[PDB]
Design a protein around this ligand. Structure first.
Ligand SMILES: O=C(O)c1ccccc1C(=O)O
Ligand SMILES: Nc1[nH]c(N)c2ccccc12
Ligand SMILES: O=C(O)CNC(=O)C(=O)O
Ligand code: NI
Ligand SMILES: [Zn+2]
Length: 331
């Protein structure tokens, strides 16, 4: 079996290899990439997402989120406090202000140390889940707004026709902005392109060991666990690499830089943080191998998770037994 230690693999496709998205994902899996839960793809040197980013300051962040932490440095939750709208230009200026800017540091490791030591004592502001794309329409390869849809994948694989659409989201980050431990909706894949700015550090648990993380999470967040059988779906819980190591949870880490893609694989739990002002674009996608994960995916039914319109059909077709109870949580 390929990649038995479940290491994060890094790929360097040629421009020829970069033409067929599905084929390259299948290739990465043939090499065992999915066992890690996360892979990095460095685009060929000839490729560009768009000409320049010189005209993006006018994008609106309608609902910036202030990420307020509770708990201890290595085990905490964060809640999202809504702030007044601001443009990306305003947000960038805020990110670079003395209050929010990345501190002096020696390297990525020093910055990682500072993040886990000090994150809880600050409340950075994130522009997350903004529907849109920064890929040029003329970019034909790995354009996250031009991928085959999850609905079409389900139809091709299962012969079922369903409602729903599947579009990308933009994420504007600053120092300490954080993504909590989670898998994707329906345990889908995700693909994430870092368009511009400072890096993003990722942590990931191999899909074959996801239940180990869940067990630890139930121990570390006991109230949350009692409230919901799938509380990680709430996307609010953080556990540091030190605490993971102390508890023997298998995981890996890697830092994504501007111009690089990351792919998360079905049921690959991931979390991470931004180093400074940046902009990423991400979307969920599916392959034939996903279908069985979609059938088995946990669901939040306590009402906290609250997911997109399009998830309805996924649950309805792949998890009909769960559908009634799950939908009671949406209404
Ligand atoms: O439902 C699960 O398998 C689960 C179990 C323990 C913690 C969290 C979850 C979750 O899905 O978020
Ligand atoms: N609010 C809340 N619930 C659980 N389980 C927590 C653990 C740590 C910090 C806050 C928490
Ligand atoms: O970039 C972020 O803030 C969060 N991204 C993801 O969880 C993802 O691409 O799957
Ligand atoms: Ni994700
Ligand atoms: Zn819930």
């Amino acid at each position: 079996a390929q990649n038995p230690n479940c290491n994060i693999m890094i790929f360097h496709p040629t421009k020829e290899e970069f033409n067929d998205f599905d084929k390259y994902i299948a290739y990465m899996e043939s090499q065992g990439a999915h066992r890690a839960g996360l892979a990095k793809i460095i685009p060929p040197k000839e490729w560009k997402a768009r000409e320049t980013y010189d005209n993006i300051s006018e994008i609106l962040i309608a609902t910036p989120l202030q990420q307020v932490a509770s708990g201890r440095a290595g085990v905490f939750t964060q809640y999202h406090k809504k702030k007044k709208a601001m443009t990306v230009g305003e947000y960038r200026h805020l990110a670079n202000s003395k209050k929010y800017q990345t501190p002096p540091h020696q390297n990525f490791e020093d910055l990682e140390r500072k993040y886990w030591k000090n994150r809880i004592y600050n409340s950075p502001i994130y522009g997350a889940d903004i529907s849109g794309s920064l890929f040029d329409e003329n970019t034909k390869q790995w354009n996250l707004g031009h991928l085959g849809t999850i609905q079409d994948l389900l139809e091709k694989e299962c012969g079922v026709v369903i409602e729903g659409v599947n579009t990308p989201y933009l994420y504007f980050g600053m120092w300490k902005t954080t993504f909590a431990w989670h898998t994707e909706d329906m345990d889908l894949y995700s693909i994430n392109y870092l368009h511009l700015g400072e890096p993003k550090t990722w942590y990931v648990v191999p899909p074959e060991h996801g239940q180990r993380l869940e067990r630890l999470a139930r121990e570390l967040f006991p109230g949350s666990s009692r409230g919901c059988g799938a509380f990680l779906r709430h996307k609010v819980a953080l556990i540091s690499p030190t605490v993971l190591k102390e508890n023997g949870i298998p995981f890996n880490r890697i830092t994504q830089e501007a111009g690089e893609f990351m792919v998360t694989f079905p049921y690959g739990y991931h979390a991470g943080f931004n180093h400074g002002f940046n902009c990423a674009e991400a979307i969920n996608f599916a392959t034939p191998r996903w279908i069985d994960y979609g059938k088995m995916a946990s669901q939040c039914s306590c009402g906290e998770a609250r997911v997109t319109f399009s998830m309805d059909a996924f649950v309805r077709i792949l998890q009909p037994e769960r559908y009634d109870l799950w939908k009671r949580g949406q209404d």
